[PDB]
Structure formats: C-alpha cells, structure tokens
Design a protein around this ligand. Sequence first.
Ligand SMILES: CS(=O)(=O)Nc1ccc(Cl)cc1
Ligand SMILES: CS(=O)(=O)Nc1ccc(Cl)cc1
Length: 209
Amino acid sequence: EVETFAFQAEIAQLMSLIINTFYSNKEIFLRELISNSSDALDKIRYESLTDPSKLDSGKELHINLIPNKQDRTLTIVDTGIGMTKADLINNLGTIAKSGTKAFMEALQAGADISMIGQFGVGFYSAYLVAEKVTVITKHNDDEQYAWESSAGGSFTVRTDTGEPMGRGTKVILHLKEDQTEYLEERRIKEIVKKHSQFIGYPITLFVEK
Ligand SMILES: CS(=O)(=O)Nc1ccc(Cl)cc1
Ligand SMILES: CS(=O)(=O)Nc1ccc(Cl)cc1
C-alpha cells in the first residue's frame, strides 16, 4: 500500500533549482545530512534527559556512513529521534515552505547556495548528487516508514517491511551516474574532515569487501 503525494509548489521549485542550477560544490550535501543527523540525535538525547525509557529503542547515539558501489548508494544512518508519518509528509519535519522562501530571499541578498542549511532545508541538497532518495525512519511514537522521491513533483510514503531499525533515520542516496566519487573512501573521509570535524557524535565510515 503506497501513498503518493504532491510536493508543495515551493518545495518542488527548490528541488528543480537544486537539480538544474550549475553549481560545482556538490560535496556540501554530506555536511548537510550529517548536520541533520546530529540535530536528530540532539533531540532524542534531550528527551532522554527526563525520561530514560525514550532510549529503550536503542541507547547508542551515532552516525554511520555506508557506501555500496554495487548498488551505487550512499546511506547515512543515525539513531536520532526519527520521524513520524506526519513528519515525513510535512516535508521531513522541516518548515520547508518558509525556509525555501528565506533561502531564495537570502540568495537575492548575497547568500551562497552552500548556506542552504541555514534555512532549514539542507536535506534537499541530497539532490545535488542523488537521482532518487529513500528515507527510512522509525520514531518512538509511530511505525517504521519509507519515504521516497525522484523529484519530478511527487513523493511516496509506505509502511516499511524491511529491516527493523529500532529508532532513527536512514537516508539512502541513489547516486547519479557521474557522482560516484562520493562512494570512495578517501573522498568521504576528506569531506567529513573538512566540514564535519566537530560533530558531537561518532561517525563511522563503513568499508566494503
Ligand atoms: C543559484 S539557484 O538558482 O538558487 N540554484 C541552486 C540552489 C541550491 C542548490 Cl543546493 C543548488 C543550486
Ligand atoms: C573528522 S573526525 O570526526 O575527526 N573523524 C572522521 C573522519 C572521517 C570520517 Cl569518514 C569519519 C570520522
């Protein structure tokens, strides 16, 4: 049972602009997704400060980066607070309508595209490198869901019958054919060291056979 939804017009506009503008500094997508993961981890940590049972679904707070060259995917996994179904539908828990407006306004006033994260819509920089993004998520208050979009104005949501995650979010980047450098271990390490060196959670870069 798969539900298909239209993006709000402003979010569709933001994604087409990310996909179609010439912009060489594509590596910032990983900084943005790691920062989102850190934000989600902060949230569950804060909730656990007054209710330790919030961590019954997983005590470890971490970020994993999993490249897969056979599948041409880069997966970012965190054990943060996760997202409910309503969150997923409401632009993955972002205020994306007003954030997009402020981002394009900032761009008029001399802001850079790499400052997308300052407007709360850094998730959508995934489409700098990915032709399709799958988001698997489990929040303590809801079931496990999969969101998916290849842009083009729509996204889908379904219950996820895959591998149970306990709690958190998995962003699966189905990379564009010319963006496979982001599966290479030395390239990922370079980006994490450059842009994410002070993230307050362990970031583990998985290796492949
Ligand atoms: C400069 S623009 O027309 O806003 N395009 C754009 C905006 C955001 C990203 Cl991440 C990439 C390109
Ligand atoms: C930049 S850091 O947090 O000091 N260490 C690190 C560097 C690279 C990767 Cl892929 C993972 C962790």
